[PDB]
Every structure is written in C-alpha cells, then in structure tokens.
Amino acid sequence: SVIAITGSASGIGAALKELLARAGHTVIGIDRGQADIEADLSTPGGRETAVAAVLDRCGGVLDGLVCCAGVNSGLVVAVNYFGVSALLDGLAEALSRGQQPAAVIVGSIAATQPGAAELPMVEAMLAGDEARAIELAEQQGQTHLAYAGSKYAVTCLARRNVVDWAGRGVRLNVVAPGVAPLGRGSEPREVAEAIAFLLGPQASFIHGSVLFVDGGMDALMRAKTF
Amino acid sequence: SVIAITGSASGIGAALKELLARAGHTVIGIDRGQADIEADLSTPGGRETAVAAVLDRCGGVLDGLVCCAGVGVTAANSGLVVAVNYFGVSALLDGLAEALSRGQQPAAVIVGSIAATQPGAAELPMVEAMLAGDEARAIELAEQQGQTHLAYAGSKYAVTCLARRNVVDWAGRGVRLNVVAPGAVETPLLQASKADPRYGESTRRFVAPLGRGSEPREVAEAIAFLLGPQASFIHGSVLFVDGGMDALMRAKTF
Ligand SMILES: NC(=O)C1=CN([C@@H]2O[C@H](COP(=O)(O)OP(=O)(O)OC[C@H]3O[C@@H](n4cnc5c(N)ncnc54)[C@H](O)[C@@H]3O)[C@@H](O)[C@H]2O)C=CC1
Incomplete structure (x- = not known):
C-alpha cells in the first residue's frame, strides 16, 4: 500500500513511517522539514501545496492517509484542525481510487477535557470557518484550551463524516493516545x-x-x- | 499462546477459534455443546464447571480469554439474557484472573454490543444489580422490566462498564482487558432477530454506513x-x- 503520513518527521508519525516501511508498505512523508514533501499545514497555501504534491507523487491514487501533524492559540487551531481537514478533504478522491483505502486521524485524550465541547472555538471549527475559529481561540488566549478544543473538534469531524466516507468506500477512524493504570506512558511505536x-x-x-x-x-x- | 474462548461453537467465537488456530495458537473452546468444554454459562454451576475445566486444560496458565458466549432478543426470557451476557462473562473473568496473571503478555476481551449505547440503558435498575454482582436481584429486575431487548441492552451496558470499572485490578495483575462492541454481524443470532415477529422490523430498520453487516471473521x-x-x-x-x-x-x- 501507498500511505501518506503528515508529521512523518518525528514522534508517532516517524514511528509509523518506520513501522510501515519495515512491513513492506510505501510511505509518502509530509512534514515541516525532513520529509518527502515539506509543507506548512498552518496556512491554506501550505495545505494546498502539500495536497498537490501528494497527488503528484501518488498519481492521484492513494491507499492510506494518516494525519499526525500537530503543534499561540491561532496556530494550534490552524494546524490541529484545519491542517487535518484540508488534507482529508483534498485527498478524499485519491483515497476513493485506492485499494481497500482507509485513513486515520491522531486525536488525543485531551479531546475528552471537560468543557471542551462547549468552547465557542469548537462550533467555528466544525462550521469550517477558520478565520472566526482563529479569532475566538486568540481571544480565549490559552494555547492548552485551543489544543483541547481542536482535538475535540477534529474527533467530532471524523465521526460526523462517517456517511460521506462510507460513500467513497474509504474507512476513517481516530486513535486517541494518552499515571495510567498500566503504570507507564506509551512508546510512539505502540500508537503506530x-x-x-x-x-x-x-x-x-x-x-x-x-x-x-x-x-x-x-x-x-x-x-x-x- | 493458549487462549480460551467462550461461545466457540458458532458465529464470532467460531470464527475466532478458527483464526487463532490457523495462526498457531492453542484454543480452548467453551460452549453449550460442540466444544472442548461443554458447559451452561447461565448458571453458577455451569460457570464453575467451565472455569475448573479451563484451568485443567491450560495447567492453570492462560495467555488469552475471550468472553463471546451470549444470547440475543430471542432468548427464553430476560433472566436468561442477564445470566449469560453478564454473569457468564463476569464469573469466567473472576475465576480465570489468576491463570491469566500467570500467562505471557496476557490479555482478555469481552464481546459487548452497540446495544450497550441504547438510550436509557444506563438507568435500567437491572444494571445496578449486575454491577453489584447480585445475580438473583438482577434476574428478578430483568424479568420485571419485561422485554428481552432491555435485558440485552442492560446486560451489554453493564458488562462493558464492568470491564472499565475494573481497569486498575486487571492492570495490577498484568493483564489487559478490553471490549469489542459489534454492530450487526451475519450470524445465527442476527438471523434469529431478523426473523422474529416482535424484533424483526427493529432489527432490519437501519443499516450501518458501510452498507452491510459484518462477517464474523471481521469481528474476530x-x-x-x-x-x-x-x-x-x-x-x-x-x-x-x-x-x-x-x-x-x-x-x-x-
Ligand atoms: N451477531 C450480532 O449481530 C451481534 C452479536 N453480538 C454479541 O456477540 C457474541 C457472539 O454472538 P454471535 O456469534 O453473533 O452469536 P451465535 O449464537 O452464533 O454464537 C454465540 C455462541 O454462544 C454460545 N452460548 C450462548 N449461551 C450460552 C451458554 N448459556 N453457555 C455456553 N455457551 C452459550 C452459543 O451456544 C453460541 O455457540 C454474543 O455475546 C452477542 O451478544 C453483539 C452485537 C451484535
């Protein structure tokens, strides 16, 4: 399979890149640096560039997509929500053309933060109104609040589009990584x-x-x- | 590894038994019949037999346990649904916890149900009795509630909560415990629901986004x-x- 991964240059994305390569798959890495495709997913222009570059590299046909890229509050919303949604939306057609295609978003247990659901930021994100979501996050002024709100919103986004993705023949799921009862934190490879x-x-x-x-x-x- | 599977004679359990066996594992099957261990998991006595028999077969060391035995809305009565779906699971977890703790990278899975998410399931009185472990009370409440679908949702809700509630005890034993929650899956259980006078329309009313039911192997x-x-x-x-x-x-x- 040919699998595109955002955030491929570090952490979970890098562990996934290694895992999939060792397992015989082909990986198209997208990140800010040290990647097949270097792009800034905090801007519409960076997203546009990255989507075009992926499509070029895979010939408009893609088997898998994983959105791992993540990080002021405006930047948090831009990368963690809109850098995911633009990539999913931009690559949905190519995924629909692939072989048993599927995509995964890396969420966060922070999506379950009490009150995240009620953050005004969140409604703006889910409405797709980036300018308004950034404005709201910036006036809230707490990066950690924007982090929780964006992870909540992006998890909702995955679920709310379950019918659209089914219609394209593409599965879409979320992984929510996390002292835990197991007595330790996870290794990036375990999430991968x-x-x-x-x-x-x-x-x-x-x-x-x-x-x-x-x-x-x-x-x-x-x-x-x- | 050595893995015990309740409900191994049919559907999801049968699919899983086959999958694991082909991958090289030793599978110990428990079911009403047509299994390594034949036991009725709807009574304390049957559960006791099953536990003792599993321990004998694995030498008191188990690497995996899957509680897949269950009944649906066409079961004999609401009491039976609770006895099997909740207590047939919990008693096997209780009885085999020590054996699992002795295994290698041991893990257990409960087969729940999307029925667990039915609105109001959490507030069914029978749920409290299940989580308290009071089987006689849970069965009485299930019978009084009057409808097998409520016993089904209640039992599936309760057993899912049970797995989550006991998360620390299982971690302390070094054993992971998770729940799989299937939607519709094209076994004899689903076919029975689809054809039932009372629940058939309910069962057939809406299909999942993927546009089909699961094959048992997909759940396995x-x-x-x-x-x-x-x-x-x-x-x-x-x-x-x-x-x-x-x-x-x-x-x-x-
Ligand atoms: N088939 C479906 O659409 C769904 C099934 N499930 C759950 O999946 C699990 C497996 O069900 P299926 O494979 O579909 O049904 P199935 O009827 O094909 O298999 C269930 C097995 O459990 C065994 N069993 C039932 N009561 C028992 C008892 N008292 N003692 C020993 N064994 C007993 C049966 O004999 C049978 O072999 C059940 O817990 C069910 O609630 C959950 C959601 C959907």
Whole structure:
C-alpha cells in the first residue's frame, strides 16, 4: 500500500513511517522539514501545496492517509484542525481510487477535557470557518484550551463524516493516545501499531471508531462514558 | 499462546477459534455443546464447571480469554439474557484472573454490543444489580422490566462498564482487558432477530454506513488484535466494530 503520513518527521508519525516501511508498505512523508514533501499545514497555501504534491507523487491514487501533524492559540487551531481537514478533504478522491483505502486521524485524550465541547472555538471549527475559529481561540488566549478544543473538534469531524466516507468506500477512524493504570506512558511505536491496524485489512469493518491507546486512563477516569 | 474462548461453537467465537488456530495458537473452546468444554454459562454451576475445566486444560496458565458466549432478543426470557451476557462473562473473568496473571503478555476481551449505547440503558435498575454482582436481584429486575431487548441492552451496558470499572485490578495483575462492541454481524443470532415477529422490523430498520453487516471473521480480527502484543498499551478500551453505526447515531460521544 501507498500511505501518506503528515508529521512523518518525528514522534508517532516517524514511528509509523518506520513501522510501515519495515512491513513492506510505501510511505509518502509530509512534514515541516525532513520529509518527502515539506509543507506548512498552518496556512491554506501550505495545505494546498502539500495536497498537490501528494497527488503528484501518488498519481492521484492513494491507499492510506494518516494525519499526525500537530503543534499561540491561532496556530494550534490552524494546524490541529484545519491542517487535518484540508488534507482529508483534498485527498478524499485519491483515497476513493485506492485499494481497500482507509485513513486515520491522531486525536488525543485531551479531546475528552471537560468543557471542551462547549468552547465557542469548537462550533467555528466544525462550521469550517477558520478565520472566526482563529479569532475566538486568540481571544480565549490559552494555547492548552485551543489544543483541547481542536482535538475535540477534529474527533467530532471524523465521526460526523462517517456517511460521506462510507460513500467513497474509504474507512476513517481516530486513535486517541494518552499515571495510567498500566503504570507507564506509551512508546510512539505502540500508537503506530494501533494506527497500522486501523489502516489495514484486519480492520475492514471498523469505521468512525475512536480507539483509545492510553493504558487504561480513559476507563479509569470516565468509566461510564463510552 | 493458549487462549480460551467462550461461545466457540458458532458465529464470532467460531470464527475466532478458527483464526487463532490457523495462526498457531492453542484454543480452548467453551460452549453449550460442540466444544472442548461443554458447559451452561447461565448458571453458577455451569460457570464453575467451565472455569475448573479451563484451568485443567491450560495447567492453570492462560495467555488469552475471550468472553463471546451470549444470547440475543430471542432468548427464553430476560433472566436468561442477564445470566449469560453478564454473569457468564463476569464469573469466567473472576475465576480465570489468576491463570491469566500467570500467562505471557496476557490479555482478555469481552464481546459487548452497540446495544450497550441504547438510550436509557444506563438507568435500567437491572444494571445496578449486575454491577453489584447480585445475580438473583438482577434476574428478578430483568424479568420485571419485561422485554428481552432491555435485558440485552442492560446486560451489554453493564458488562462493558464492568470491564472499565475494573481497569486498575486487571492492570495490577498484568493483564489487559478490553471490549469489542459489534454492530450487526451475519450470524445465527442476527438471523434469529431478523426473523422474529416482535424484533424483526427493529432489527432490519437501519443499516450501518458501510452498507452491510459484518462477517464474523471481521469481528474476530479485531478481537485477535486486542489479544496480541501489537495492542500492548490498549487497556479498558471499547472498540466499536460496527461499520460506522455508532459514529452515525452518536457522533459527539467518545
Ligand atoms: N451477531 C450480532 O449481530 C451481534 C452479536 N453480538 C454479541 O456477540 C457474541 C457472539 O454472538 P454471535 O456469534 O453473533 O452469536 P451465535 O449464537 O452464533 O454464537 C454465540 C455462541 O454462544 C454460545 N452460548 C450462548 N449461551 C450460552 C451458554 N448459556 N453457555 C455456553 N455457551 C452459550 C452459543 O451456544 C453460541 O455457540 C454474543 O455475546 C452477542 O451478544 C453483539 C452485537 C451484535
């Protein structure tokens, strides 16, 4: 499979890149630097450039997409929400043309922060109004609030488009990485393994799911919420 | 590794038994019949038999346990639904916890249901009795509630909560425990619901976004993943395997 990965140059994206390469897949890496495709996903121009470059590289046909790129509050909203949505939307056609195509967004357990759902930022993001979402985040003035709000919104975005993606024949799921009950934090490779699972043919009936990979933390803190 | 599977004689459990066996694992099947271990998981006595028999077969060391035995809305009565879907799971987890703790990279999976997310399921009285472990009370409440679908949703809700509530105890034993929550899957259980006078329309009313039901093997693959070392940091999670149904019906819940 030919799989595009944003944030391929560090952390989870880099671990996934390595994992998939070792497993025999072809990886198109997209990141700010040290990548096949170097682009700034915080701007519409960077997103446009990255989408065109991916399409060129894969000949308009793509088997997988993983959005891992993430990071003032305006920048947080621009990268973590709109840098994901522009890439998903820009590459949806190419994915629809691929072989058992699937995509994964790397969310965060911060998406479950109490009150995130009610942040004005969030409505603007889900409406697709970037200028208004950035303005709202900047007047809120807390980067960590923008982080939680963007992760909440991007997780909602995945689920809300479950019908559109099904219609294209492309699965779309979220991985929500996380002391946890398991007594440690995760290695980037462990998150990468969950992503690779969701991308692959073993997950052929999994669509619109949010898979927590957090050593039990969400179960401990939100037992009743599922 | 050595993995016990309740409900191995049919549907999802049968698919998983085949999948694991082909991958080289030793599978210990438990079912009403047509299994290594024949036991009725709807009574304390049957569960006791099953646990003792599993321990004997694995030498008191287990690397995997999958609680897949269950009944749906065409079961005999609401009491039976609770006895099997909740207590047939919990008693096997209780009884085999020590054996699992002794295994290598051990892990367990409960097969839940998207029915767990039915509105109002959380507030069904029978749910409290299940989580308290009071089987006689849960069965009485289930019977009084009057409808197998409520016992089905209640039992699936409760057993999912159980997995999450006990997250720390399982971590302390070094054993991961997760739930798989299927939407419709093209076994004999689904066919029975589809043809039922009372619940058929309900069952056939809406299809998942993927436009089809799951094949049992697709659910088995998700279970096998959660059992294995590539899921080493996944614990207390509920993995929906439903072709988009839950995302469609509860888009903002996670
Ligand atoms: N088929 C579906 O659409 C869905 C199924 N599920 C769950 O998946 C699990 C497996 O169901 P399926 O494979 O579809 O059904 P199935 O009927 O094909 O298999 C269930 C197996 O459990 C065994 N079992 C039932 N009661 C038992 C008892 N008292 N003692 C020992 N074994 C017993 C049965 O004999 C059967 O072999 C069940 O927990 C069910 O609730 C969840 C969502 C959807």
